[PDB]
Amino acid sequence: QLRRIREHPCFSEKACHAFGRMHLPVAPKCNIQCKYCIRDFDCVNESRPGVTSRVLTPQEALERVDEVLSKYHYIKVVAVAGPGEPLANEETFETLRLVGEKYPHLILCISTNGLLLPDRIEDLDRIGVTNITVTLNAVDPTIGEQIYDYVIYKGERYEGLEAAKILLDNQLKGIEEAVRRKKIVKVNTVLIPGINDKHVFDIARKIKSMGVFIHNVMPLIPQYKFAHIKPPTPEEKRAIQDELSKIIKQMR
Numbered sequence: 234q235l236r237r238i239r240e241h242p243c244f245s246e247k248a249c250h251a252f253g254r255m256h257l258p259v260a261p262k263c264n265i266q267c268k269y270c271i272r273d274f275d276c277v278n279e280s281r282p283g284v285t286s287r288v289l290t291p292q293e294a295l296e297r298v299d300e301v302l303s304k305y306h307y308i309k310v311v312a313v314a315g316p317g318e319p320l321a322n323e324e325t326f327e328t329l330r331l332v333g334e335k336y337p338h339l340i341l342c343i344s345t346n347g348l349l350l351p352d353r354i355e356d357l358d359r360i361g362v363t364n365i366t367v368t369l370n371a372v373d374p375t376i377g378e379q380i381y382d383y384v385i386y387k388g389e390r391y392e393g394l395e396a397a398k399i400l401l402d403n404q405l406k407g408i409e410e411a412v413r414r415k416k417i418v419k420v421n422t423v424l425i426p427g428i429n430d431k432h433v434f435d436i437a438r439k440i441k442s443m444g445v446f447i448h449n450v451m452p453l454i455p456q457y458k459f460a461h462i463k464p465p466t467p468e469e470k471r472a473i474q475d476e477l478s479k480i481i482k483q484m485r
């Protein structure tokens with residue numbers, strides 16, 4: 234195959250060399266704190282590091298779509314991926330509702346840390362989102378606890394193992410529900426040497442059974458509490474990716 238994969242640069246190798254995507258930075262708030270993230274910068278799960286985007290209101294974001302779709306025609310996808318957690322900001326839903334209603338041809342895409350995916354998947358479906366990226370760095374909460382300072386869920390900040398268990402249970406429930414609703418799911422995993430760099434095999438097996446379409450293993454960008462960790466070398470990353478390809482399709 235369907236068009237939401239074939240023409241999405243992040244879900245098809247062929248589409249990456251042919252079609253473009255644009256991000257609308259309408260979602261400044263975040264609801265967790267990753268130990269590799271400095272909040273000054275656009276969510277590094279779905280952005281190159283060290284970037285500071287101007288935050289747009291839904292109306293301004295629609296205006297940027299208008300102008301981009303005028304100067305360029307290769308644009309197939311419009312997404313919200315930052316600067317914080319898209320599902321933690323009502324402006325995400327207002328923006329994609331405006332874009333989808335005016336430009337039904339565009340593929341609507343979102344990235345999420347997954348915490349609010351169970352609570353908001355019904356909204357995403359109703360507004361026409363067909364592609365969802367979830368960043369899943371652990372399927373064992375004792376490993377998750379090593380990756381997150383805290384999560385904010387339903388008006389309470391949690392730390393430690395409790396926070397990790399709340400996050401993981403919601404990520405899995407949300408992915409399951411997204412798959413049930415025939416959404417195309419991509420899972421990002423930040424490869425963190427010494428923390429989840431062999432656990433990623435367990436992640437791949439789990440998301441494969443759950444119906445995730447593609448897996449994107451990203452090398453750690455050392456920052457914040459992980460600033461001292463030596464990132465995986467390129468050849469180290471390709472070796473893991475090559476092995477994980479026998480479990481689930483890898484984004485290359």
Ligand code: SF4
Nearest residue numbers: 263265266267270276
């Ligand atoms: S999800 Fe993590 S990396 Fe992304 S903005 Fe929130 S704390 Fe930073």
Ligand code: SF4
Nearest residue numbers: 243254312314342344
């Ligand atoms: S949110 Fe992620 S998958 Fe969607 S267009 Fe942006 S980079 Fe690609």
Ligand SMILES: [Cl-]
Nearest residue numbers: 235236237238
């Ligand atoms: Cl389609």
